[PDB]
Fold methoxy mycolic acid synthase 4.
Amino acid sequence: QAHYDVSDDFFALFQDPTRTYSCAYFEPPELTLEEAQYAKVDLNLDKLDLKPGMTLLDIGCGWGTTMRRAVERFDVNVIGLTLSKNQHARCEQVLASIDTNRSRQVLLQGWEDFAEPVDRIVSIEAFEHENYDDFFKRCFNIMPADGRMTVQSSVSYHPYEMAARGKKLSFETARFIKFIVTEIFPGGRLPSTEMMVEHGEKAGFTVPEPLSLRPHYIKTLRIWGDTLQSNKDKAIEVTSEEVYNRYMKYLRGCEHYFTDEMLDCSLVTYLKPGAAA
């Protein structure tokens, strides 16, 4: 598995300047990838009913862009969880950089080890963060009566659903998912939307209809792919041709199966019983 670790410098050769490793939101459609990454952060935060002085938890806080945007836009305290030491170090500096009185904290740890009261939770494609019942129970229990959470995740369809598009394409898609979860996100899993919704419900949350981000991911993946390609030699020099090919397969293949409607990406909102109208 640790054969599949790639240095941060490689990702830098395909991602926008914020280093955001998740679906962008092209509204309006003319946004650059970077602007669209801020637009995706806003799309998530604007769902959360955030008010000054509240504490936002960011599960998989990445390079800290979401937390910074939350502090600046909503005048909230933030706590981020990441399992990356590089990310942790960057987040601390990103947040110390902010001119604010608000509390800002980043913890090198998973959500399993998190049990502090917070007001709202955001989690954007946190692939490093079986455990689903425990996750949603924890998120429910650490929030107040009006708590809300968003989780954005790439998703797969159950094999049953996949078979309805015909066997040829269902076996092909299952193999490719196996590739994502072996070589790109080792030990990862792609839940389905229905899993995301029904685990949230079992935990007591109200779950409105998930937002599909599929066409936005097609665009993100196209830009990422053309960009990595544009940097072939520089990428190859930084890792190997092996790592370059793997990521082109990933990027192009995802764009393909998203376009064919065999993968999706859902932004699911979870509302506690007392959430504001």
Observations:
- The chain has one domain: 1-277.
- The radius of gyration is 18 Å.
- The beta strands are 55-59, 77-82, 104-108, 120-124, 148-155, 211-212, 264-271.
- Residues 1-277 form a domain with the Rossmann fold fold (CATH 3.40.50.150).
